[PDB]
Structure formats: C-alpha cells, structure tokens
C-alpha cells in the first residue's frame, strides 16, 4: 500500500488481524507498521490556495 503523507502516532486500537484503516470516503487514514505493531495516522501532506 503506497502513498504520500505525514505519519503520526495514532490512538486507534486495531484488532490484531487488521492492518490498514479507512474512513467513510474509503481513503487510507490509519495503518499498522509491520516491524513494530503500532498504529500510525496518515495525515495528508498540506496543500492550500495561495
């Protein structure tokens, strides 16, 4: 699963069989690191009008 984002610490407690996380709009916003079983939130990189 590839993408671009800011990976921060997450308070979402996954069940042990689950690896990724999706919101209502089917975008990956949570993920589990495979090396160390910790949950990371994937904030989108900042964009904005100038």
């Amino acid at each position: 699963l590839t993408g671009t984002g800011v990976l921060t610490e997450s308070n979402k407690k996954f069940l042990p069989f689950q690896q990724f996380g999706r919101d209502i709009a089917d975008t990956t916003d949570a993920v589990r690191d495979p090396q160390t079983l910790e949950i990371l939130d994937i904030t989108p990189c900042s964009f904005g009008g100038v």
Partner: protein, 220 residues
Amino acid sequence: YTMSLGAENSVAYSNNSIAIPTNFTISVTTEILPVSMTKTSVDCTMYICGDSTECSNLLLQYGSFCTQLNRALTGIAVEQDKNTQEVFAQVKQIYKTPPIKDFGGFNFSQILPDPSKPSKRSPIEDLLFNKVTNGLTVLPPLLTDEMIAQYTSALLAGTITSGWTFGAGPALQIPFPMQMAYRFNGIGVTQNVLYENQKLIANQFNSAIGKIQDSLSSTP
C-alpha cells in the same frame, strides 16, 4: 386509504348576519429559511491527477476546463458571503438593549442574548445551534457565528427599543406597550384594546415564546 383534505366547515352565511371576534390569541410561529451553504473549493488539477506530472501534461491538452470549474466554485463561494451580507447586515448601527428589562410585562429573555454563555447567543439560538449537526477545501465564512448572533442581537434591540423607526432612519426610542399599540393600529384594532388588556397580551406572548422553545426542543 383515499386521503381527506380537511374537515368540512360549513360557514353559516346569510345576508344580514356577521361574526365579530370577542377575544384574541397572540400566536408566535417559526419560519426557518436557509441563507448560505458550505463554501467548497476543488483543486481541479489535484482532483483529476494528484501529483502525477504525466497526468497534468495530458490534462493540459483539454484546455481551460479546470479554470472554468475553479471560477464557478469561486463565484459560488463569494455568492454565499454576499447572501449572508444581504440577509443579516441590514443595519450599520449595533443597537443594545438597556440593562433594565422593563418592557411593561413583556419577557424577551428567550430571544435576547444570554450573558452567561460565552457565545453570546440567545437560549433559542443556542438550541438551534445544538439541533443542527483530494484537492477539496472548505473556505470559512466571512461572518462567524458570534458576529451573525451580534447582528441578530442588534436587530432585536432595534425592534424592541425603537420599533420600525431604526429601519427607516435614526432609531427613535418609544415605550414597548405604545409600540405594540401602534402595531395594533396597523392591523386595524384600536389602541384602547391593547392598553386595557395589556397584562393578558403580555402573558399570552410569554406563553407563546415558551411554547416555541418547548416545540423546538421536542421536535427532531
């Protein structure tokens, strides 16, 4: 079933009989009108392509479609702020109620702003705000909710302390029973009726305002 439009009410018409009212009800009704939407802007290039350079190079072959869509969304976004200006900013003076709420028995505490609340909203407005729950951005509105509440508070203070005079020029102070008597004469009822039955009218008005708050708090 086949539905029924209403109960039949046969009016007792005859050529020399009239029906004259002997009493009245002060009725307060709600009317909810939408004013603006959420100001949404969509980056057309980022929505279609994201960060892909080849996709944007192929998207430039289609011309100025993205400029058209961004211009239309910008026009909608400024039209929402124009709508809020046209609805709420009809007074250039911020009127305030007097600290003593002596309006001849009329109670406006459910519609005047609550000093204990940090949002400076009325209890009715607070209940109304409690009852409403990839290149996309949401632009904040130009008028925040506390400034819109300040505009409504100014309108309430103007229509309570000055009647309709503040809408046509300088705000001319007038006692609220006298203003109510003027409104009574506008609908063709003499001033004496208002003055003689002023306690009853104030009690009916307070009861109707409380029923408005109860009906809003009890209807989803």
